[PDB]
Amino acid sequence: TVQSERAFQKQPHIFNNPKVKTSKRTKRWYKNAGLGFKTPKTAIEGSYIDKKCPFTGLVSIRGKILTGTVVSTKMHRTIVIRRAYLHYIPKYNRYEKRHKNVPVHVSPAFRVQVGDIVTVGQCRPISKTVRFNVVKV
Amino acid sequence: LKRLAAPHHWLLDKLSGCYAPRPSAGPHKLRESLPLIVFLRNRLKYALNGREVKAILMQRHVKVDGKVRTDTTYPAGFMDVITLDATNENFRLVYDVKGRFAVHRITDEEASYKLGKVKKVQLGKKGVPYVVTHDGRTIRYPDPNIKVNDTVKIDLASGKITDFIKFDAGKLVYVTGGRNLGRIGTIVHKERHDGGFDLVHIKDSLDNTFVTRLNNVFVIGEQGKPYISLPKGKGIKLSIAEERDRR
Amino acid sequence: LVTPQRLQRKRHQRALKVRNAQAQREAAAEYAQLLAKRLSE
Amino acid sequence: RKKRKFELGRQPANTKIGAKRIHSVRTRGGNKKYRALRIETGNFSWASEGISKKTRIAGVVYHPSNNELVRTNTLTKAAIVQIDATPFRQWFEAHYGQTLESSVESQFSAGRLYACISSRPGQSGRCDGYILEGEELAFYLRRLTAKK
Amino acid sequence: TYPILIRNQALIPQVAENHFVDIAPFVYYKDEEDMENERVITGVDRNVFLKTLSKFKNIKNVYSATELHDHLMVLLGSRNTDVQLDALLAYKNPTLNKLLDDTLFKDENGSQSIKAEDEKVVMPYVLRIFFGRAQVPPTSGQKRSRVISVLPNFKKPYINDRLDYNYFFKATLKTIRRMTGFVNIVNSRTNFPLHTNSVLQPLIYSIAMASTEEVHLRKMASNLRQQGLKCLSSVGNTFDWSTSMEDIYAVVVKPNLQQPSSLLRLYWAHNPSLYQFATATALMDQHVKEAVIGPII
RNA sequence: AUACAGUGAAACUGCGAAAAAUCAGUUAUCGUUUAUUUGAUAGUUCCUUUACUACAUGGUAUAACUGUGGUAAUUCUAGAGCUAAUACAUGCUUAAAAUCUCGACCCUUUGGAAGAGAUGUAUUUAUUAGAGUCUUCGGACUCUUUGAUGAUUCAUAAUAACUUUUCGAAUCGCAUGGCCUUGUGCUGGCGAUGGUUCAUUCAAAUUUCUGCCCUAUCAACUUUCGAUGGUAGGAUAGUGGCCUACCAUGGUUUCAACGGG
């Protein structure tokens, strides 16, 4: 299923002509994200819309590349990541433990599992708190 | 008028009032240029005070790279020439072994041109290819083998290009900016990351394999045959302790 | 008022525009020959 | 230039049809904008053959974010409007020789077509729409069935 | 003259002076004096009948002395609305003389005056001029969206631009008429318009074979537009009577016109071309010859 | 010096007066402004033009001024008439254009060419493009057409229109020169201002993450009146619930969220 809203899911400035014909229905646009990240064929031939996709949408990944693990998928089309980095302040004299949380935008071209390791990139702001973007599991 | 913490390679006197000159908008950045007040007031001492520097600027005696530029706070930064018509002088301002702006006395036949690293090659308008350089001389119609981070040789009578030094593995190089300032030699290794932090490594008389940022380096020419002269023994920074051990 | 100076200035403006266009369309042809020799090598 | 504040907004343009008025508004840093107020005409373009024409807009019949904007006839971006269809019909007869796609030949003799607004005349200064044709025409015929 | 026209604006005897001025205005500083006299005259019976035609000429065009002045069009429309449904047509034409929304609203004497004022206020405003392109496209769109309108447009073109020798066989006015014919054929009474366009193209050909670059470019654009008009129309009597001397002068030159010779030869077109015949010379004398050969064969 | 000419009151104009809370840094702006400086930047405004035209350059609408008063005071005033522009508002830019192809033919080319064809920018869309031999032994014979980025829907070009409209010099000081058609004829320099777009420069703007006291006889906080996301829109220099609709019911936390000084 593709359409899920009162508005038609538009990817503007790229549209087919009806008098010409192909088995693609729209000259579907895709891009390589950079820093060695490679687009998958599931994301290419998936006819999902994703105006905020960092392979087929409008956004372009740049700069920070963090790691993390999935803590929840209990939000609509956004996921939350945890980062429990090892921490040390000399007032303790011990390797203490903290954790860092962040929300990250997610694409319908990728499976999500609570527990697996995700590699996340930095992009433009997407929400009130979502700033990053998933690029590769 | 915010000052008293200048770029401290200008070396202005600290008991010289309170402030320090603000370089205006121009071809170079803030803390890697040198305005003509700091030049003609406390770097070679031809004029005592700043209004006398304004007098010698207004009286058309000084021209930076071809034309007059009657302005005190004119940030005439790196690699350009200053053709003082009186005193027969051609100050090219280049760097030194320590981090300051060393001066030259260039011949006229070398002061007739200047060079500089490009920053981008683009297609401007109506399908016209134009390049830029580090001092803002966005000039049109290059040879289209000009790559990014390369040097052209501006003619300085017109704004044309006479030659260019297509940099690759192994053509003589200068450096600028960073704690490895004023060094030469280009032949150890050529590293290329994805996002900066890379250098064409350096080889000198003592063969010091050195690196810095690729934004902090630009080319001169062929090994042993440079396009620009270089001050005080073509700066190496061997050691001052070894210098006082030998001589 | 039409003094002799103002139409001299208008003449200089017109000749300035024509001479700038002449030099630009000379430089375009020069870059065309340079791209021709870059093709040939 | 470009300070920051905490929380406020401004009054919208929420333009109508009839008695076209354009009011300029001051933008910090160039590109002095124009709010269209009650604009009655627009630039409408065929997608396939690629011909624009200025055309009297008839009315917006669908809005995908507020149904009340169709009641008040509000011209925002991405709406479904009727216009005239006659200059595009004139170009079609003139340069194809048909003198009349199936689901737009059926709309020609009905009289008014459906098109999508792509400018933001509340901020930009003009209204443009392209006549929907293809899978957009399919889903918007399904949106006409969602109307009825 | 300007002081006297000001006194007449400050004004029986006024109507008798208006009859004498109607004689002088049927006949013909003069621009400002004509503006002042029009502003006076817009504020008899047979002199009124002639002045209604003169004001219809001034609200259909400003052809001879000037080129489509908007103040002259406003004064002429005010005089015509003072001379002669009618209120709605007058308000639409007044908004048109004031053009986008008026053309969108106006998309039989009211129709005559409508084509008059429309082609007056967009009577070839300039070549491009950053608005003249949009104005010429708007005038062409109104002329295609408004058969009596196109008939009156060709009638106004022929009224701009004797005819007996022009159908059998003033250089600057001929160049202006050639530009008028190019502008008229630039649009997306057929026999009279074709006769007038053929006469203009033939007079341009004669005056060019006898400013010269103006006549050359105008004759080239007019011949290409005439080939386009014959290809978009597709009567052979007046067709032969026009094509005879043109192809005869282009006998040796044909070794636009070649595309017309290849488009007027592909059944009834073959009969129209064999009514004249040359064709082997057009075939032998390159893709421009290859397409003509491998189509005409 | 019968327009003024160096001097200059006043005034108009131009410019500038803008207790993770603060921050010290770090990252990006392929998510915005880009004023000032510096460098390149643009022949196109009338041709229904011979009963041939504003461009050797067109229009208001006023200060200072002059005059009448008020008033109790002055960084208070109302009326009237004058007069300027880089103020305001229009506005045409003379081989009407001009340049490059194709250049057949000649005469030999480094041409000169009759006629087959094209020509601004800005705004808002919708596209499209934007990825083995012959060998004078010397060379040639057709070769595989595109800028950069790690990354583009980038840069840019063309296409079809819409432009309440953009700009495309109605300006200024110095010298007065060359020409010959001796006419107030043709041309001409140095550089002050203004303007289109791009780059650089500084300046602003968010945004990334590393970092600060005492606390659980402080553990639940927040969706109200969007608290947390999606989709479309309003807006806005701009991303972004920053707000408006519909959908989902979330998010933060015992590692001390939340509160207390």
Nearest protein residue, CA measured to C1' of F249 = A75
Residue E68, CA: closest nucleotide via C1'? F48
B40 and B102 belong to one structural domain = yes
Å from C15 to nearest chain B CA? 20
B:C CB pairs within 8 Å: 13
Structure tokens at D111: 């009289």
Which residues have CB under 8 Å from E206's CB, separation 6+? Answer: none
Nearest CA in chain E to D56: E104
Hey, how many other C-beta atoms are within 10 angstroms of the C-beta on E192?
14
Longest Cα separation, chain C:
61
In a domain, B242, yes or no: no
Q: Using CB atoms, which chains have 3+ pairs under 8 A with B?
A: A, C
Hey, how many other C-beta atoms are within 10 angstroms of the C-beta on E144?
16
Nearest CA in chain A to D104: A18
Cβ pair D73, D58 in contact under 8 A:
no
- DSSP character at residue E64: S
Nearest protein residue, CA measured to C1' of F124 = D126
Q: Which of C27, C30, C38 sits opposite B144 (nearest CB)?
A: C38
Between CA E254 and C1' F191 the distance (Å) reads 57
- DSSP character at residue A37: B
Between CA E107 and C1' F232 the distance (Å) reads 35
- Structural domain boundaries, residue A7: 1-137
Residue E101, CA: closest nucleotide via C1'? F164
Please give the Cα distance from B200 to B8 (Å, whole number): 28
Q: Give exposure, B116-128, as e/b (b: 16+ Cβ within 10 Å).
A: bbbbebeeeeeee
Hey, how many other C-beta atoms are within 10 angstroms of the C-beta on C28?
13
In units of Å, what resolution does this entry have?
Answer: 6.0
B130 and B199 belong to one structural domain = no
φ, ψ (nearest 5 deg) of residue E212 = -70, -40
End-to-end CA distance of chain C: 61
Please give the Cα distance from B134 to B154 (Å, whole number): 12
B120 and B52 belong to one structural domain = no
Cβ pair E143, E122 in contact under 8 A:
no
In a domain, B243, yes or no: no
User: D87–E101: do the CB atoms touch at under 8 Å?
Assistant: no
> Among all chains, which residue has been given the structure tokens 């008025």?
D21
- How many structural domains comprise chain B? 3
User: D87–E100: do the CB atoms touch at under 8 Å?
Assistant: no
Q: Which of C27, C28, C34 sits opposite B143 (nearest CB)?
A: C34
CATH number, domain with residue A73: 2.40.50.1000
Interface of A with B in 20-49 (CB under 8 A): 35-36
Nearest protein residue, CA measured to C1' of F93 = C14
Which residues have CB under 8 Å from B76's CB, separation 6+? Answer: B26, B27, B28, B33, B34, B35, B36, B39, B64, B65, B69, B82, B93
Chains D and C physically touch (3 or more Cβ atom pairs below 8 Å): no
Please give the Cα distance from B115 to D52 (Å, whole number): 51
Please give the Cα distance from E121 to E226 (Å, whole number): 26
Q: Which of A8, A10, A19 sits opposite D48 (nearest CB)?
A: A19
> What are the distances in angstroms from CA E130 to CA B144, D54, E7, E125?
35, 17, 41, 11
Q: Give exposure, D93-102, as e/b (b: 16+ Cβ within 10 Å).
A: eeeeeeeeee
In a domain, B246, yes or no: no
CATH number, domain with residue B217: 2.30.30.30
Which residues have CB under 8 Å from D7's CB, separation 6+? Answer: none
3-state secondary structure of E291: helix
- How many structural domains comprise chain A? 1
Contacts of A8 in chain D (CB under 8 A): 64, 136, 139-140, 143
> Among all chains, which residue has been given the structure tokens 């209120």?
E87
Please give the Cα distance from E251 to E296 (Å, whole number): 18
Å from A35 to nearest chain B CA? 7
Nearest CA in chain D to A7: D64
Between CA C29 and C1' F110 the distance (Å) reads 16
Cβ pair D75, D56 in contact under 8 A:
no
B60 and B89 belong to one structural domain = yes
- Structural domain boundaries, residue B58: 1-109
Q: Which sign does the torsion angle of CA D129, D134, D135, D137 carry?
A: positive
3-state secondary structure of E204: helix
What burial class does residue A29 get, using C-beta atoms within 10 Å of its C-beta: 0-12 exposed, 13-18 middle, 19+ buried?
Answer: exposed
Q: Is B194 on the interface with A (CB under 8 A)?
A: yes
B97 and B158 belong to one structural domain = no
Sequence length of chain B is 247
Residue E111 Cα to chain centre, angstroms: 18
Which residues have CB under 8 Å from B164's CB, separation 6+? Answer: B142, B143, B145, B146, B150, B151, B152, B153
Structure tokens at E231: 């290809």
Q: Nearest-CA neighbor of B70 among B85, B55, B89?
A: B55
Method: cryo-EM
B199 and B229 belong to one structural domain = yes
Please give the Cα distance from E270 to E131 (Å, whole number): 44
Q: Give exposure, E32-60, as e/b (b: 16+ Cβ within 10 Å).
A: eebbbbbbbbbeeeebeeebeeebbbbbb
Between CA D78 and C1' F246 the distance (Å) reads 16
Enumerate the β-bridge partners of residue B222.
Answer: B225
φ, ψ (nearest 5 deg) of residue D104 = -110, -25
Q: Is C37 on the interface with B (CB under 8 A)?
A: no
Between CA E79 and C1' F80 the distance (Å) reads 39
Domain boundary among B109, B126, B141: B109
Please give the Cα distance from D32 to D124 (Å, whole number): 9
In a domain, B245, yes or no: no
Q: Nearest-CA neighbor of A112 among A137, A131, A88, A129?
A: A137
Å from C2 to nearest chain B CA? 35
B102 and B144 belong to one structural domain = no
> Among all chains, which residue has been given the structure tokens 């501006």?
B154
B98 and B151 belong to one structural domain = no
Query: How big is chain B by its Cα radius of gyration, in Å?
Result: 19
Nearest protein residue, CA measured to C1' of F58 = C1
- Three-state SS for chain D is CCCCCCCCCCCCCCCCCCCCEEEEECCCCCCCEEEEECCCEEEEEECCCCCEEEEECCEEEECCCCCHHHHCCCCCCCCEEECCCHHHHHHHHHHHCCCCCHHHHHHHCCCCCCEEECCCCCCCCCCEEEECCCHHHHHHHHHHHHHC
Enumerate the β-bridge partners of residue D24.
Answer: D34
Strands A132-136 and A100-105, bridge-based pairing: parallel
Nearest CA in chain C to B160: C27
Structure tokens at A8: 């038609």
B17 and B119 belong to one structural domain = no
Q: Is A15 on the interface with D (CB under 8 A)?
A: yes
> What are the distances in angstroms from CA B125 to CA B198, B246, C36, D7, E260?
33, 60, 21, 41, 39
Enumerate the β-bridge partners of residue B95.
Answer: B101
End-to-end CA distance of chain D: 51
Give the DSSP letter string of A51-109.
Answer: TT-TTTSS----S-EEEEEEEE--STTEEEEEE--EE--TTT-S-EE--EEEEEE--TT
Nearest CA in chain C to B128: C28
Cβ pair E158, E196 in contact under 8 A:
yes
B10 and B34 belong to one structural domain = yes
Enumerate the β-bridge partners of residue A97.
Answer: A86
Find and list the nucleotides of strand F having atoms within 7 Å of a protein beta carbon.
3-4, 27-54, 56-58, 93, 95-100, 115-117, 120-128, 147-153, 155-176, 184, 187-189, 191, 197-212, 228-248, 250-255
Q: At what angle do helices E150-160 and E132-145 cross, to 10 degrees?
A: 130
User: D56–E104: do the CB atoms touch at under 8 Å?
Assistant: yes
Cβ pair B165, B140 in contact under 8 A:
no
3-state secondary structure of A131: coil
Please give the Cα distance from E75 to E81 (Å, whole number): 10
Interface of B with C in 72-131 (CB under 8 A): 128-129
Please give the Cα distance from A71 to A84 (Å, whole number): 11
In a domain, B144, yes or no: yes
> Among all chains, which residue has been given the structure tokens 């978009």?
E232
φ, ψ (nearest 5 deg) of residue B84 = -70, 110
Å from B197 to nearest chain A CA? 13
Give the DSSP letter string of chain B.
Answer: ---SS--TTS---SSS-S------S-SS-STT---HHHHHHHTS-S-SSHHHHHHHHHTT---BTTB----TT----TT-EEEETGGGEEEEEEE-SSSSEEE----HHHHT-EEEE---EEE-SSS-EEE--TTS--EE---TTPPTT-EEEE-SSSS-EEEEE---TT-EEEE-SSTT-S-----S-B---SSS---B----SS-------GGGEEEEEBTTB-SS--HHHH-----HHHHHHH-
Q: Is D96 on the interface with A (CB under 8 A)?
A: no
Contacts of E144 in chain D (CB under 8 A): 90, 94
Please give the Cα distance from C16 to B115 (Å, whole number): 30
Please give the Cα distance from E110 to E93 (Å, whole number): 9
In a domain, B140, yes or no: yes
Between CA C30 and C1' F241 the distance (Å) reads 57
B160 and B171 belong to one structural domain = no
